[PDB]
């Protein structure tokens, strides 16, 4: 049945986390479920409802924020912890029920000799309130002097690069991550599986 999970899970154009791609959707609904968890992934954790039974609650709408991160940094995708992605690149709210998926992507996203198509907002003035794409690549001022938007001693480009070689550790292969935020706004329900 007509649902869009393909172009976001088996996709080809996965963007950097600093500009993580929102995708609001309206799924496929029948008398049975909406997707399968996994046959070959790397990390998969769904809150509120156990990761084996996502279809247990119908949702009015969802946001499947897709991006790529390091291996171990999937750690700091989960709500409650405050890693480097959680504060500046991507926060999940401390009271959250949704899910996170992360599959290894060395075989696709790694260019021999060093891929650099993937960035992430390293510096940023303060923490993000949940889900605010800080797309602005404006120069960052860590001090008392604005720099007219030109890099200097304390004026730094805010995005930086992962740099995926193919020889990396198991915790450094780019895991393509897709995080499903299940919204709670009260309208007729769209996203779910069975009857």
């Amino acid at each position: 049945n007509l649902c869009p999970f393909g172009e976001v899970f088996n996709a080809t154009r996965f963007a950097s986390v600093y500009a993580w791609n929102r995708k609001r959707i309206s799924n496929c609904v029948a008398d049975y479920s909406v997707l399968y968890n996994s046959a070959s992934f790397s990390t998969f954790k769904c809150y509120g409802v156990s990761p084996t039974k996502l279809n247990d609650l119908c949702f009015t709408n969802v946001y499947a924020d897709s991006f790529v991160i390091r291996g171990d940094e999937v750690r700091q995708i989960a709500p409650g912890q405050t890693g480097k992605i959680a504060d500046y690149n991507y926060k999940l709210p401390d009271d959250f029920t949704g899910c996170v998926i992360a599959w290894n992507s060395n075989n696709l996203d790694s260019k021999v000799g060093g891929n650099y198509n993937y960035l992430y907002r390293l510096f940023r003035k303060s923490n993000l309130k949940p889900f605010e794409r800080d797309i602005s690549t404006e120069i960052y001022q860590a001090g008392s002097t604005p720099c007219n938007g030109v890099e200097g001693f304390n004026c730094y480009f805010p995005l930086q690069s992962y740099g995926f070689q193919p020889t990396n550790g198991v915790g450094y292969q780019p895991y393509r991550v897709v995080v499903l935020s299940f919204e709670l706004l009260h309208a007729p329900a769209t996203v779910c599986g069975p009857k």
């Epitope: 504060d87 990396n168 550790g169």
Partner: antibody, heavy 117, light 107 residues
Framework: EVQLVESGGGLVQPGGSLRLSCAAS????????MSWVRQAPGKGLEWVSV???????FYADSVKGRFTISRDNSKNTLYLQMSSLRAEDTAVYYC???????????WGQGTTVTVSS | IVLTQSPGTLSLSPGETATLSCRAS???????LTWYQQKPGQAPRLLIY???SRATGIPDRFSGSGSGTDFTLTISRLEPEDFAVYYC????????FGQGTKVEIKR
């Protein structure tokens, strides 16, 4: 014309509490990854803790929970508040400006902490 | 993650070349790892950010190299101010310094 003042050495019994002071010149500590590291006496160089631009601390796994890293944005200060200390933590502690991809670039003078019964 | 730093120690003469081979437990990328210089007692300053990107004030005589299993800091023409102990740290979750490599004058 830029540096991190370090002050407040320490001479303490184990299990006590203590404090050390970092103070930025030019740097706005409310806009940086600040981080304390420690040299044990003549042994390695262990990273201790990090405070993010926003309030968020990450401590070394051997000093987890027992320390605290705190902020005074109003008067531009970084605080090491040490609790429930231990014998080996005798060290020299460094306040260090941090740019993870550019590496910790600005480092304080470092101040000595002695923990012993 | 563990960052061994081969070899144990390196002795050198003024004006001479140098290589120092930091070696990860795993094999890792090159962007994150950095190379610091510590004088004896003073506070550790920075030498190399990224794989080999020399930082501000860093003389052209320092060069990073390598990737994966090992990275190497190198010096073309020596100078006593370059005589210190170098720590390679790979800023993974949080820095994991190598045990250092005292650089001392061949005598």
């Amino acid at each position: 014309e830029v540096q991190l003042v370090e002050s407040g050495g320490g001479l303490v019994q184990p299990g006590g509490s203590l404090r050390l002071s970092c103070a930025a010149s030019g740097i706005t500590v409310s806009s940086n990854y600040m981080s304390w590291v420690r040299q044990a006496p003549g042994k390695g160089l262990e990273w201790v803790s990090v405070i993010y631009s926003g309030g968020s601390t990450f401590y070394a796994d051997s000093v987890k929970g027992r320390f605290t890293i705190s902020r005074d944005n109003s008067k531009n200060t970084l605080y090491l508040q040490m609790s429930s200390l231990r014998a080996e933590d005798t060290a020299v502690y460094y306040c260090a400006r941090d740019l993870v991809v550019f590496g910790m670039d600005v480092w304080g003078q470092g101040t000595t902490v002695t923990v012993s019964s | 993650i563990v960052l061994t730093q081969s070899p144990g120690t390196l002795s050198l003469s003024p004006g001479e070349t140098a290589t120092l081979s930091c070696r990860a437990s795993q094999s890792v990328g090159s962007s994150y790892l950095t190379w610091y210089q510590q004088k004896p007692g003073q506070a550790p300053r920075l030498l190399i950010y990224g794989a080999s990107s020399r930082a501000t004030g860093i003389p052209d005589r320092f060069s990073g190299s390598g990737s994966g299993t090992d990275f190497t800091l190198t010096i073309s023409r020596l100078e006593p101010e370059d005589f210190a102990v170098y720590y390679c740290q790979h800023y993974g979750s949080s820095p994991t310094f190598g045990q250092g490599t005292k650089v001392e004058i061949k005598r």
